[PDB]
mmCIF file with all atom_site columns, C-alpha atoms (C1' of nucleotides) in Angstrom:
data_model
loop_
_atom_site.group_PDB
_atom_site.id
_atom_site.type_symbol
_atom_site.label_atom_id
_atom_site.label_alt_id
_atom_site.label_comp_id
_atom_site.label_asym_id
_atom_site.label_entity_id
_atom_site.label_seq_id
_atom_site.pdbx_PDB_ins_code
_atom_site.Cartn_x
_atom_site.Cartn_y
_atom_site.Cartn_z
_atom_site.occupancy
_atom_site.B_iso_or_equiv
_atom_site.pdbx_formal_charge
_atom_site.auth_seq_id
_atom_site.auth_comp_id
_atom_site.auth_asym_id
_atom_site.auth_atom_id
_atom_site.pdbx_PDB_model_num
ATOM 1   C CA    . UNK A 1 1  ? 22.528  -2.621  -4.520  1.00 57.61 ? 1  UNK A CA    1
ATOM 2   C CA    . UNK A 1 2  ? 20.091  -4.052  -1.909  1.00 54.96 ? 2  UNK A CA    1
ATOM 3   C CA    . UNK A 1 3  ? 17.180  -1.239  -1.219  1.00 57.31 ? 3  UNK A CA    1
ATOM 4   C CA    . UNK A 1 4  ? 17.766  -1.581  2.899   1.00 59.59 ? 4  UNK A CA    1
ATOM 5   C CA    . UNK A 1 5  ? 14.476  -1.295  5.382   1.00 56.85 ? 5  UNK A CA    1
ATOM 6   C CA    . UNK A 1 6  ? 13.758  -0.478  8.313   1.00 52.52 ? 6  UNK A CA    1
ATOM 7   C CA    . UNK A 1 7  ? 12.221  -3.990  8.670   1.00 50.17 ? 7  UNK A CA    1
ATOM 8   C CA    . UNK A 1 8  ? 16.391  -4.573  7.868   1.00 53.25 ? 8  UNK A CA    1
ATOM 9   C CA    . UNK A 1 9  ? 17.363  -1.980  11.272  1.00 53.33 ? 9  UNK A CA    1
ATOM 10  C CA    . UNK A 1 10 ? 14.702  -3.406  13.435  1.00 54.51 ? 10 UNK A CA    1
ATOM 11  C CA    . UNK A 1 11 ? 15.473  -6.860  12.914  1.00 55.01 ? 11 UNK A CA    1
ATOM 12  C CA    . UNK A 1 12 ? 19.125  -6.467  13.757  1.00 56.09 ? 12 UNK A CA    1
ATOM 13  C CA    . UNK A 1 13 ? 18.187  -4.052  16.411  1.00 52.62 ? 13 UNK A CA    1
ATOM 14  C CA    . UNK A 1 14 ? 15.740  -6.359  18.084  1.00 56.10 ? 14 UNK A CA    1
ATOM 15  C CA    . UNK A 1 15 ? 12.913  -4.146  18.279  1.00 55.60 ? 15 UNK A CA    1
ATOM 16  C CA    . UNK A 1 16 ? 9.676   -3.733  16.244  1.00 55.28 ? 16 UNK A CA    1
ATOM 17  C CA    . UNK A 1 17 ? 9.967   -2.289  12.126  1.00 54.66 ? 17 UNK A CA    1
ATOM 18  C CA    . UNK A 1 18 ? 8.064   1.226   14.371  1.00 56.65 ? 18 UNK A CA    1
ATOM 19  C CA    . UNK A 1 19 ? 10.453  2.049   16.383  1.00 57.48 ? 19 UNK A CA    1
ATOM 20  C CA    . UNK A 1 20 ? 13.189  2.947   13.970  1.00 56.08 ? 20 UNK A CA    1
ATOM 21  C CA    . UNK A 1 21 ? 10.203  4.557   12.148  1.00 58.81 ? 21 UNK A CA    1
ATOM 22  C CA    . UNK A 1 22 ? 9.616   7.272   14.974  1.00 55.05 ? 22 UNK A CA    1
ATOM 23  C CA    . UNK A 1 23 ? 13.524  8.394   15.361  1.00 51.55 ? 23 UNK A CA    1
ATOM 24  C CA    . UNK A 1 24 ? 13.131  9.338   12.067  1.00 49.07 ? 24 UNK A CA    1
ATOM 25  C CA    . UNK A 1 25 ? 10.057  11.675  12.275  1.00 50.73 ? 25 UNK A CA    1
ATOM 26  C CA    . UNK A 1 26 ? 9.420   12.865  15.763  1.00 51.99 ? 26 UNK A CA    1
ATOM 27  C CA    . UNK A 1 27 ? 11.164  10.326  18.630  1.00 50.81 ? 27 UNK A CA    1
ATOM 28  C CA    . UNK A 1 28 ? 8.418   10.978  21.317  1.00 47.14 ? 28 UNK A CA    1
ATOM 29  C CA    . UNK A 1 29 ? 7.423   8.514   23.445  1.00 42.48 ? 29 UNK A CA    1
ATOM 30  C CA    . UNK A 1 30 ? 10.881  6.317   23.556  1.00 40.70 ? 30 UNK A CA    1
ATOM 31  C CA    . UNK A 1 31 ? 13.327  4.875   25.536  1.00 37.33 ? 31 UNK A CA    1
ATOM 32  C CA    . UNK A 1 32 ? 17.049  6.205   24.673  1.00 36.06 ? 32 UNK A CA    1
ATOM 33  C CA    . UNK A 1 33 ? 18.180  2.361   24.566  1.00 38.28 ? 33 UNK A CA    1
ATOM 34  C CA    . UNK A 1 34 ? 15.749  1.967   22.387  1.00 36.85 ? 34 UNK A CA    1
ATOM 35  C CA    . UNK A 1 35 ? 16.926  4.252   20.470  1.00 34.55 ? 35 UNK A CA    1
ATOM 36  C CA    . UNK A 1 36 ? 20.344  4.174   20.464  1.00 35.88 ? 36 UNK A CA    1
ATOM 37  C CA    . UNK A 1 37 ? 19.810  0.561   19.004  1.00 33.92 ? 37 UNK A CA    1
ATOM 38  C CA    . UNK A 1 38 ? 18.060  1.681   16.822  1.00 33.17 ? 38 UNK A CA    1
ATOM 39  C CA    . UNK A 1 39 ? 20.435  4.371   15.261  1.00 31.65 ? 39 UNK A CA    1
ATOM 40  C CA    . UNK A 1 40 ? 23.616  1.543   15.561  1.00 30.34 ? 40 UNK A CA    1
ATOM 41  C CA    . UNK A 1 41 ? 21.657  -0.974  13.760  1.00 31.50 ? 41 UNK A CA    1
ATOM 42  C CA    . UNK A 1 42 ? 20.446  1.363   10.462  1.00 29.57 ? 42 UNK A CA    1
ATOM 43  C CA    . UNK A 1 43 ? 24.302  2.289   10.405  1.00 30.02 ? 43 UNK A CA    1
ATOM 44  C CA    . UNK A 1 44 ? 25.577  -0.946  10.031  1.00 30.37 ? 44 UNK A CA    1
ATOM 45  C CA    . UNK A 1 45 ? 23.346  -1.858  7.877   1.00 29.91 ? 45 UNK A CA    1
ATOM 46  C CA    . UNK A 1 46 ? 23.865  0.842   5.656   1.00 31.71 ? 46 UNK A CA    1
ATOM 47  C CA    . UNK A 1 47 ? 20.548  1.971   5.222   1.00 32.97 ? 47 UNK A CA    1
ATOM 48  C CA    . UNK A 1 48 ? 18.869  4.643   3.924   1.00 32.60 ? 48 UNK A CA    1
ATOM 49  C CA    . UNK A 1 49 ? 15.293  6.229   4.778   1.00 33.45 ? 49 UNK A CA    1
ATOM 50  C CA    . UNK A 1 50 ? 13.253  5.397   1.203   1.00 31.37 ? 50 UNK A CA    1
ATOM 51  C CA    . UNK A 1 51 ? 11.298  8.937   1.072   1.00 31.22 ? 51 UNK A CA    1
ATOM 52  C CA    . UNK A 1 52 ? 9.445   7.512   -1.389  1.00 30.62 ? 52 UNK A CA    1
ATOM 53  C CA    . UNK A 1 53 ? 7.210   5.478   1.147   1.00 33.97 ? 53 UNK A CA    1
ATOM 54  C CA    . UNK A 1 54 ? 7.436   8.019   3.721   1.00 33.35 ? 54 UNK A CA    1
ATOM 55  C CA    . UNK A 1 55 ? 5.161   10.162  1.793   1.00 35.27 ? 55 UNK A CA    1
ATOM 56  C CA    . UNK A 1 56 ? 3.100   7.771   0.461   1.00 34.81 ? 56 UNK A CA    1
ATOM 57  C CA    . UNK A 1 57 ? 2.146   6.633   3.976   1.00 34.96 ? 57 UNK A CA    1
ATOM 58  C CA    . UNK A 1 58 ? -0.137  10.095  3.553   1.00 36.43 ? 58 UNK A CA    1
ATOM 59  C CA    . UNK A 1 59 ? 1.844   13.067  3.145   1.00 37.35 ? 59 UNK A CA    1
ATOM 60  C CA    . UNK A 1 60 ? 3.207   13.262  -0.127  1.00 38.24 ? 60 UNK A CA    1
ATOM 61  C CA    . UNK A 1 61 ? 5.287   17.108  0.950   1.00 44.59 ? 61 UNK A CA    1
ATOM 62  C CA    . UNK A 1 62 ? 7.702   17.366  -2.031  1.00 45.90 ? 62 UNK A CA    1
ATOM 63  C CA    . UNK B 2 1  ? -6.341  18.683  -6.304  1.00 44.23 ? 1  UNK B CA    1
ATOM 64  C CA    . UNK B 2 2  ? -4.875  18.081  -9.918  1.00 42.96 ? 2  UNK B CA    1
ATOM 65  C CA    . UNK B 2 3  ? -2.610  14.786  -8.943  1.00 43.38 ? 3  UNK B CA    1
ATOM 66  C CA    . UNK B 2 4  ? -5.439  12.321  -7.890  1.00 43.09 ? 4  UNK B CA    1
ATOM 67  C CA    . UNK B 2 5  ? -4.949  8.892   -7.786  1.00 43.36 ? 5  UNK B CA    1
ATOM 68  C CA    . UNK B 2 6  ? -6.218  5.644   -9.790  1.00 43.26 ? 6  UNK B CA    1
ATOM 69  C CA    . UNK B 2 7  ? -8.864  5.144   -7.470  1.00 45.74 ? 7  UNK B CA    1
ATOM 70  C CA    . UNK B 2 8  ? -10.213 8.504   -7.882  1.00 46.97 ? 8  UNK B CA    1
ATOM 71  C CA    . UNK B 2 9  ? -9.679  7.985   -11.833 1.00 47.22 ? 9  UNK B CA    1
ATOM 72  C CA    . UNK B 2 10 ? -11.659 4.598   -11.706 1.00 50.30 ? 10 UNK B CA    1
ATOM 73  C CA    . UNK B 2 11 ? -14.625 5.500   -9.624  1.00 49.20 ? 11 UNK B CA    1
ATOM 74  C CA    . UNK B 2 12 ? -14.917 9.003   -12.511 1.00 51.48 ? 12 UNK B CA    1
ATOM 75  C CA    . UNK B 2 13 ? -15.108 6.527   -15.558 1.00 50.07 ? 13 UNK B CA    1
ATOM 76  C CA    . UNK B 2 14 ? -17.025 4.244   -14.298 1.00 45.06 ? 14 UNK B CA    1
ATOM 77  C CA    . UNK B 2 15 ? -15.073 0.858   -14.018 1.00 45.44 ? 15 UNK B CA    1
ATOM 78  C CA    . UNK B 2 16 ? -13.001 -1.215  -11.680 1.00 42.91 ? 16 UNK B CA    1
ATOM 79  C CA    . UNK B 2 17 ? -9.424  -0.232  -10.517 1.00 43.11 ? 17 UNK B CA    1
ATOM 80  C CA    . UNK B 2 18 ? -8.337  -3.223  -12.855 1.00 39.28 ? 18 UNK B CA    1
ATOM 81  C CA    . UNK B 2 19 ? -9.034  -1.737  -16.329 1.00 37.05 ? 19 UNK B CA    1
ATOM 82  C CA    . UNK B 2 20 ? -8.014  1.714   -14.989 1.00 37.80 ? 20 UNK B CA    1
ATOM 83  C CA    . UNK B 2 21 ? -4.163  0.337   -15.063 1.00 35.58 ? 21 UNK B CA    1
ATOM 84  C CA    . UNK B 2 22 ? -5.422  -1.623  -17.865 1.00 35.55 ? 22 UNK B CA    1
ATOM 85  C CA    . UNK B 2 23 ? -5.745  1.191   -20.635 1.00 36.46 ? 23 UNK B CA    1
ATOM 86  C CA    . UNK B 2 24 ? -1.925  2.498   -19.275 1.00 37.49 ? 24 UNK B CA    1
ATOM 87  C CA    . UNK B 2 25 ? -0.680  -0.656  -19.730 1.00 38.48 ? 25 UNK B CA    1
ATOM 88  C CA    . UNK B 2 26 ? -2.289  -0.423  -23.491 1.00 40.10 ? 26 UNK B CA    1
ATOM 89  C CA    . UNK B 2 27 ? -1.435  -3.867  -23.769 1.00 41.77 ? 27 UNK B CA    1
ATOM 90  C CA    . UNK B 2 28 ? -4.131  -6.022  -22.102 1.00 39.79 ? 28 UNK B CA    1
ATOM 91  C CA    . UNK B 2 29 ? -7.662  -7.374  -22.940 1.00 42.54 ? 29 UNK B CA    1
ATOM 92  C CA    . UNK B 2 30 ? -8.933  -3.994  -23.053 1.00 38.85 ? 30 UNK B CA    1
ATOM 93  C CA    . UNK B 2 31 ? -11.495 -2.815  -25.000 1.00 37.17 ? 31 UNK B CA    1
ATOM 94  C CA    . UNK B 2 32 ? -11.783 0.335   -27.357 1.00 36.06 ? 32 UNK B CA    1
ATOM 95  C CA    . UNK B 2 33 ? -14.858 1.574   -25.394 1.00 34.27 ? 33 UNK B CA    1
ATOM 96  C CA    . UNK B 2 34 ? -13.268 1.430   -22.286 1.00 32.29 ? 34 UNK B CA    1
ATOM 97  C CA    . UNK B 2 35 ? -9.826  3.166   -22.708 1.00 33.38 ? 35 UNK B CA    1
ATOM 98  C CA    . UNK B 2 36 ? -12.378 6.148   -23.794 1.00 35.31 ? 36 UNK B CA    1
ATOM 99  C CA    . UNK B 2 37 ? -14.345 5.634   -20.767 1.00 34.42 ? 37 UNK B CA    1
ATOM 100 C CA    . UNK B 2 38 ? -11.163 5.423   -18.541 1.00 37.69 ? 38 UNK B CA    1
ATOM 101 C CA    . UNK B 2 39 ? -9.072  8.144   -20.437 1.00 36.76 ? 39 UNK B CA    1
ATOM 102 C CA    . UNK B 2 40 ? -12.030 10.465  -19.472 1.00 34.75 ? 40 UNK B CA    1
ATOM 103 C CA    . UNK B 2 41 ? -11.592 10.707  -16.044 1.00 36.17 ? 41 UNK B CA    1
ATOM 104 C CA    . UNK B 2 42 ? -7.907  10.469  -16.468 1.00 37.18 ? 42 UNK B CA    1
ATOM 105 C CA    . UNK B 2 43 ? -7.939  14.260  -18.519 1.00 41.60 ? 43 UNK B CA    1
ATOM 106 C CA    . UNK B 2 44 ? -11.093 15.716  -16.326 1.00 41.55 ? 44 UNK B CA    1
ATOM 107 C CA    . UNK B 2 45 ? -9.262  14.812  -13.227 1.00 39.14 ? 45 UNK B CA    1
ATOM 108 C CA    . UNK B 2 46 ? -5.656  14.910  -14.582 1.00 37.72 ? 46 UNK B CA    1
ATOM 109 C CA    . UNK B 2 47 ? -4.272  11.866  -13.007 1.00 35.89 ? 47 UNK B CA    1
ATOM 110 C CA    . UNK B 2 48 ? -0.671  12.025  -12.238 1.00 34.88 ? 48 UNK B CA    1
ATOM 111 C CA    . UNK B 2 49 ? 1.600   8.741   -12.075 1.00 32.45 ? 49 UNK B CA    1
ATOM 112 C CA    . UNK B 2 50 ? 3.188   8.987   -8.796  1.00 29.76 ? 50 UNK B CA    1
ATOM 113 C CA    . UNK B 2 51 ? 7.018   7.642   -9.484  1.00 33.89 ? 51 UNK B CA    1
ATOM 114 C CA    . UNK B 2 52 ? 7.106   6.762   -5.539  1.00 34.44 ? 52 UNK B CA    1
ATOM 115 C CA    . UNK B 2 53 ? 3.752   4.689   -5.606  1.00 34.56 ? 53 UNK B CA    1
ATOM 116 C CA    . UNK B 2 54 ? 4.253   2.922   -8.957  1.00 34.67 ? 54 UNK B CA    1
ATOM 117 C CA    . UNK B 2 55 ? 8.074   2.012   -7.924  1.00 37.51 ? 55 UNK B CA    1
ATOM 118 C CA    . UNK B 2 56 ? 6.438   0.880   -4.351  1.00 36.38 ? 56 UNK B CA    1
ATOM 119 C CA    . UNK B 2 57 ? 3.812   -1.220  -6.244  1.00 36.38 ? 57 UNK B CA    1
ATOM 120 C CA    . UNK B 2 58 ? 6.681   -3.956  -7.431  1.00 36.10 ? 58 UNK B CA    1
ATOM 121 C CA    . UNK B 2 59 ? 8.163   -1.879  -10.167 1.00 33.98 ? 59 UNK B CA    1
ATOM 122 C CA    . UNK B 2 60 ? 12.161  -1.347  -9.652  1.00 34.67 ? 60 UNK B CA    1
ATOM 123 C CA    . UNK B 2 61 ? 12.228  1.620   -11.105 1.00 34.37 ? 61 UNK B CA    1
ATOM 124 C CA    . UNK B 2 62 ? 14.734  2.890   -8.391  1.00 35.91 ? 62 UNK B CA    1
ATOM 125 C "C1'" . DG  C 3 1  ? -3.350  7.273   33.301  1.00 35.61 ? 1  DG  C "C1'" 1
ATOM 126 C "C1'" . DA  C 3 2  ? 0.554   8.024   30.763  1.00 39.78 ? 2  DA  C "C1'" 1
ATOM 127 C "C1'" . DA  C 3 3  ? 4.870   6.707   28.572  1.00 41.70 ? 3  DA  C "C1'" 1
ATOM 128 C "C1'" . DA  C 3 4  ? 6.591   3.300   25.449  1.00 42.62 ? 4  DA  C "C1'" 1
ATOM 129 C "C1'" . DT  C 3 5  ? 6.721   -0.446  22.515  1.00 40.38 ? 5  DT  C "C1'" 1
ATOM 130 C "C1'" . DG  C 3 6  ? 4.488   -3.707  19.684  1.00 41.99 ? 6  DG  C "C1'" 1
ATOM 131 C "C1'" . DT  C 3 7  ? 0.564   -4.998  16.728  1.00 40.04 ? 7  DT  C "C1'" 1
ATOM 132 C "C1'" . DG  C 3 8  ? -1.874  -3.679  12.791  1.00 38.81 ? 8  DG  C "C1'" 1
ATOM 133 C "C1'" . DA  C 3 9  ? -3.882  -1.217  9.145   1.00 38.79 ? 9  DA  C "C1'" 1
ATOM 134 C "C1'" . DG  C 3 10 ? -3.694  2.226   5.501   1.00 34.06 ? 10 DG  C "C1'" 1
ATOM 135 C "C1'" . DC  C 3 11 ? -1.657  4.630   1.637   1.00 38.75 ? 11 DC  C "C1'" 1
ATOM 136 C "C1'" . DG  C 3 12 ? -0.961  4.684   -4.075  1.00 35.65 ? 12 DG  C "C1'" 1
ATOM 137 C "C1'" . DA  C 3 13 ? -0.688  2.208   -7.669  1.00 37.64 ? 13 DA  C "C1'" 1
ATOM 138 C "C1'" . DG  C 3 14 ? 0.311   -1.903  -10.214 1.00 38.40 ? 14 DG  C "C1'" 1
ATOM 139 C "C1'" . DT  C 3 15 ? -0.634  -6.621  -11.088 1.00 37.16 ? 15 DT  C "C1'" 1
ATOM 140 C "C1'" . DA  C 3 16 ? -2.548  -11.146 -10.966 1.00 39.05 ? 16 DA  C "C1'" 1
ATOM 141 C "C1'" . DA  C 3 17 ? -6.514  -15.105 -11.962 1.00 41.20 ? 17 DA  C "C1'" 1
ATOM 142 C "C1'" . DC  C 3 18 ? -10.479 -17.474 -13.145 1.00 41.42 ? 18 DC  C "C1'" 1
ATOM 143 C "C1'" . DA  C 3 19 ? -15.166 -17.362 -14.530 1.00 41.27 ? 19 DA  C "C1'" 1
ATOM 144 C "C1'" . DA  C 3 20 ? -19.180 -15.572 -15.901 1.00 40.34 ? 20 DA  C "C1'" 1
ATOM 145 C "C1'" . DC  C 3 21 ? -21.363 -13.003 -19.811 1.00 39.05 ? 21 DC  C "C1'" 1
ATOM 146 C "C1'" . DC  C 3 22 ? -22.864 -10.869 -23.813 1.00 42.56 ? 22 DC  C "C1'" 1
ATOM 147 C "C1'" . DG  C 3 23 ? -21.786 -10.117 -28.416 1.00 43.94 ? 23 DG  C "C1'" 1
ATOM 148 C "C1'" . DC  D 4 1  ? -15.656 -18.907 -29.103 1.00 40.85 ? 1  DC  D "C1'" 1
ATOM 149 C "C1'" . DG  D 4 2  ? -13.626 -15.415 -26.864 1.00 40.47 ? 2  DG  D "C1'" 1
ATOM 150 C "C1'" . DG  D 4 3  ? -12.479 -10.874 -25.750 1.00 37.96 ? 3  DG  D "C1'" 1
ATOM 151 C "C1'" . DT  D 4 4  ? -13.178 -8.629  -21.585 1.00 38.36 ? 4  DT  D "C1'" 1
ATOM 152 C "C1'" . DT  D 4 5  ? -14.345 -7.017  -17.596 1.00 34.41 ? 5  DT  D "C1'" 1
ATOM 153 C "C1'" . DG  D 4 6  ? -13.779 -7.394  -11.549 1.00 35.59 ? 6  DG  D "C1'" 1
ATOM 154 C "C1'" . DT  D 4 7  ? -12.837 -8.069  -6.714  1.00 38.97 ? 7  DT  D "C1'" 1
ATOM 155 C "C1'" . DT  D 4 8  ? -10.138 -8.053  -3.920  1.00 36.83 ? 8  DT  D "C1'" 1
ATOM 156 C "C1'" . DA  D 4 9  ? -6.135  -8.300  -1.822  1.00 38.09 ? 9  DA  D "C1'" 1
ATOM 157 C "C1'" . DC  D 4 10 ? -1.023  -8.310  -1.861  1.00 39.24 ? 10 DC  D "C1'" 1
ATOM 158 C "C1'" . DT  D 4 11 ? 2.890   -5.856  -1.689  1.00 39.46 ? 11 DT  D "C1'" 1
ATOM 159 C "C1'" . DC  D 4 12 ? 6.266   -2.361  -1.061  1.00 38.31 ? 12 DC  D "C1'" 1
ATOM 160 C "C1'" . DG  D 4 13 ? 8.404   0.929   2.447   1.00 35.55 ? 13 DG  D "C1'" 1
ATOM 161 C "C1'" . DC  D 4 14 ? 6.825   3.732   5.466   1.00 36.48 ? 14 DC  D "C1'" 1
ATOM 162 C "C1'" . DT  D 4 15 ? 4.314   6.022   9.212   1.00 40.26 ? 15 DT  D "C1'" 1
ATOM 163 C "C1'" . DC  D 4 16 ? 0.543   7.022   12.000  1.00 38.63 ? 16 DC  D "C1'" 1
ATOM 164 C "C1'" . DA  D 4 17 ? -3.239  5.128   15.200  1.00 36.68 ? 17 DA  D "C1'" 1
ATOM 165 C "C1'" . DC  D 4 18 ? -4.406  2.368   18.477  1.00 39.96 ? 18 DC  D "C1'" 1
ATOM 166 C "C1'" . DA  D 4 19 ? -4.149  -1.676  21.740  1.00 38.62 ? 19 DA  D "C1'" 1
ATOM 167 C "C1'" . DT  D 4 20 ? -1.570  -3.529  25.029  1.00 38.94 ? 20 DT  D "C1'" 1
ATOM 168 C "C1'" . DT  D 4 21 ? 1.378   -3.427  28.694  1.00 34.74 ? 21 DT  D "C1'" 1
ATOM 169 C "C1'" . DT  D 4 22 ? 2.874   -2.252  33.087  1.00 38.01 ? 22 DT  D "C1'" 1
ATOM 170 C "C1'" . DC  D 4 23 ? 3.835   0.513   36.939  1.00 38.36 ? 23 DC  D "C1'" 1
#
DNA sequence: GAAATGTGAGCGAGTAACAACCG
DNA sequence: CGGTTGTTACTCGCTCACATTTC
Protein backbone atom coordinates (compact mmCIF):
# COMPACT_ATOMS: atom_id res chain seq x y z
CA UNK A 1 0.00 0.00 0.00
CA UNK A 2 1.31 3.34 -1.39
CA UNK A 3 1.45 6.03 1.71
CA UNK A 4 -0.63 8.84 -0.58
CA UNK A 5 0.37 12.82 -0.19
CA UNK A 6 -0.92 15.65 -0.52
CA UNK A 7 1.95 16.41 -2.98
CA UNK A 8 -0.26 13.15 -4.67
CA UNK A 9 -3.92 15.55 -4.39
CA UNK A 10 -2.26 18.68 -5.50
CA UNK A 11 -0.62 17.35 -8.39
CA UNK A 12 -3.76 15.81 -9.81
CA UNK A 13 -5.66 18.77 -8.63
CA UNK A 14 -3.43 21.27 -10.33
CA UNK A 15 -2.79 23.45 -7.54
CA UNK A 16 0.15 23.91 -5.10
CA UNK A 17 1.00 20.71 -2.24
CA UNK A 18 -0.66 24.09 0.38
CA UNK A 19 -3.69 24.30 -0.72
CA UNK A 20 -5.00 20.86 0.04
CA UNK A 21 -3.00 21.48 3.27
CA UNK A 22 -5.39 24.40 4.48
CA UNK A 23 -8.91 22.45 3.77
CA UNK A 24 -7.67 20.25 6.12
CA UNK A 25 -6.94 22.61 9.09
CA UNK A 26 -8.74 25.87 8.79
CA UNK A 27 -9.83 26.70 4.81
CA UNK A 28 -9.50 30.56 5.21
CA UNK A 29 -8.40 32.51 2.65
CA UNK A 30 -9.62 30.18 -0.50
CA UNK A 31 -11.41 30.03 -3.46
CA UNK A 32 -14.35 27.25 -3.40
CA UNK A 33 -12.94 25.97 -6.92
CA UNK A 34 -10.04 25.71 -5.38
CA UNK A 35 -11.27 23.80 -3.12
CA UNK A 36 -13.59 21.69 -4.47
CA UNK A 37 -10.54 20.40 -6.59
CA UNK A 38 -8.97 19.93 -4.07
CA UNK A 39 -11.41 17.61 -2.08
CA UNK A 40 -12.18 15.52 -5.72
CA UNK A 41 -8.59 14.98 -6.26
CA UNK A 42 -7.56 13.47 -2.46
CA UNK A 43 -10.73 11.18 -3.13
CA UNK A 44 -9.64 9.68 -6.09
CA UNK A 45 -6.61 9.25 -5.07
CA UNK A 46 -7.47 7.56 -2.09
CA UNK A 47 -5.60 9.40 0.27
CA UNK A 48 -5.34 9.77 3.65
CA UNK A 49 -4.13 12.84 5.93
CA UNK A 50 -0.63 11.20 7.56
CA UNK A 51 -1.19 12.76 11.25
CA UNK A 52 2.01 11.80 11.85
CA UNK A 53 3.55 14.88 9.92
CA UNK A 54 0.80 17.08 10.80
CA UNK A 55 2.06 17.25 14.25
CA UNK A 56 5.43 17.16 13.64
CA UNK A 57 5.14 20.34 11.54
CA UNK A 58 4.98 21.86 15.42
CA UNK A 59 2.13 20.72 17.29
CA UNK A 60 2.55 17.36 18.35
CA UNK A 61 -1.53 17.43 20.25
CA UNK A 62 -2.00 13.66 20.85
CA UNK B 1 8.95 19.12 29.06
CA UNK B 2 9.90 15.33 29.59
CA UNK B 3 9.73 14.27 25.62
CA UNK B 4 12.60 16.50 24.20
CA UNK B 5 14.13 15.83 21.17
CA UNK B 6 17.73 14.62 19.86
CA UNK B 7 18.80 17.98 19.43
CA UNK B 8 18.04 18.93 22.87
CA UNK B 9 19.75 15.46 23.96
CA UNK B 10 22.96 16.33 21.88
CA UNK B 11 23.58 19.89 22.83
CA UNK B 12 23.13 18.28 27.06
CA UNK B 13 26.02 15.70 26.42
CA UNK B 14 28.06 17.55 24.73
CA UNK B 15 28.47 16.13 21.10
CA UNK B 16 27.13 16.41 17.61
CA UNK B 17 23.57 15.25 16.57
CA UNK B 18 25.55 12.37 14.73
CA UNK B 19 26.78 10.28 17.71
CA UNK B 20 23.53 11.16 19.57
CA UNK B 21 21.66 8.55 17.03
CA UNK B 22 24.90 6.89 17.12
CA UNK B 23 24.80 5.30 20.74
CA UNK B 24 20.80 4.19 19.79
CA UNK B 25 21.91 2.65 16.94
CA UNK B 26 24.60 0.74 19.36
CA UNK B 27 26.06 -0.45 16.34
CA UNK B 28 28.38 2.22 14.87
CA UNK B 29 31.97 3.55 15.45
CA UNK B 30 31.01 4.69 18.75
CA UNK B 31 33.01 4.90 21.52
CA UNK B 32 32.52 3.66 25.23
CA UNK B 33 33.07 7.23 26.55
CA UNK B 34 30.64 8.66 24.48
CA UNK B 35 27.47 6.45 24.79
CA UNK B 36 28.07 7.56 28.67
CA UNK B 37 28.35 11.06 27.67
CA UNK B 38 25.25 10.81 25.33
CA UNK B 39 23.14 8.41 27.60
CA UNK B 40 23.46 11.28 30.19
CA UNK B 41 21.47 13.71 28.74
CA UNK B 42 19.23 11.09 27.34
CA UNK B 43 18.06 10.01 31.35
CA UNK B 44 18.45 13.85 32.77
CA UNK B 45 16.28 15.02 30.00
CA UNK B 46 14.33 11.76 29.31
CA UNK B 47 14.36 11.74 25.62
CA UNK B 48 11.42 10.15 24.06
CA UNK B 49 11.60 8.45 20.45
CA UNK B 50 8.88 10.06 18.63
CA UNK B 51 7.28 7.00 16.39
CA UNK B 52 5.93 9.90 13.92
CA UNK B 53 9.45 11.63 13.51
CA UNK B 54 11.60 8.49 13.33
CA UNK B 55 8.99 6.83 10.70
CA UNK B 56 9.14 10.46 8.84
CA UNK B 57 13.00 10.32 8.93
CA UNK B 58 13.07 7.28 6.13
CA UNK B 59 12.12 4.51 8.46
CA UNK B 60 8.81 2.53 7.17
CA UNK B 61 7.76 1.75 10.20
CA UNK B 62 4.09 2.49 9.12
C1' DG C 1 -4.68 46.63 1.40
C1' DA C 2 -6.66 42.35 1.65
C1' DA C 3 -7.93 37.83 -0.10
C1' DA C 4 -5.81 33.89 -2.18
C1' DT C 5 -2.48 31.04 -4.02
C1' DG C 6 2.18 29.77 -4.62
C1' DT C 7 6.96 29.71 -2.92
C1' DG C 8 9.70 28.31 0.78
C1' DA C 9 11.37 27.03 5.14
C1' DG C 10 10.97 24.53 9.47
C1' DC C 11 9.96 20.58 12.35
C1' DG C 12 12.03 15.72 14.61
C1' DA C 13 14.85 12.43 14.04
C1' DG C 14 17.61 9.29 11.41
C1' DT C 15 21.30 8.57 8.28
C1' DA C 16 25.10 9.24 5.24
C1' DA C 17 30.52 10.38 3.93
C1' DC C 18 35.13 11.58 3.99
C1' DA C 19 38.95 13.39 6.44
C1' DA C 20 41.36 15.02 10.01
C1' DC C 21 43.21 13.65 14.64
C1' DC C 22 44.87 11.74 18.68
C1' DG C 23 45.79 7.59 20.89
C1' DC D 1 46.76 2.14 11.69
C1' DG D 2 42.38 3.10 12.82
C1' DG D 3 38.54 3.86 15.62
C1' DT D 4 35.89 7.83 15.91
C1' DT D 5 33.99 11.86 15.94
C1' DG D 6 31.07 16.17 12.79
C1' DT D 7 28.60 19.27 9.78
C1' DT D 8 25.45 19.79 7.57
C1' DA D 9 21.86 18.94 4.95
C1' DC D 10 18.33 15.77 3.04
C1' DT D 11 14.17 13.83 3.50
C1' DC D 12 9.58 12.70 4.82
C1' DG D 13 4.67 14.56 5.19
C1' DC D 14 2.83 18.24 6.76
C1' DT D 15 1.60 23.00 7.96
C1' DC D 16 2.40 27.62 8.98
C1' DA D 17 4.64 32.18 7.46
C1' DC D 18 5.51 35.09 4.22
C1' DA D 19 6.11 36.94 -0.61
C1' DT D 20 3.87 37.67 -4.52
C1' DT D 21 0.10 38.73 -7.14
C1' DT D 22 -3.58 41.39 -8.65
C1' DC D 23 -7.54 44.16 -8.42
Amino acid sequence: MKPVTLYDVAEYAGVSYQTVSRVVNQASHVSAKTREKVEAAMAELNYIPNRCAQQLAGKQSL
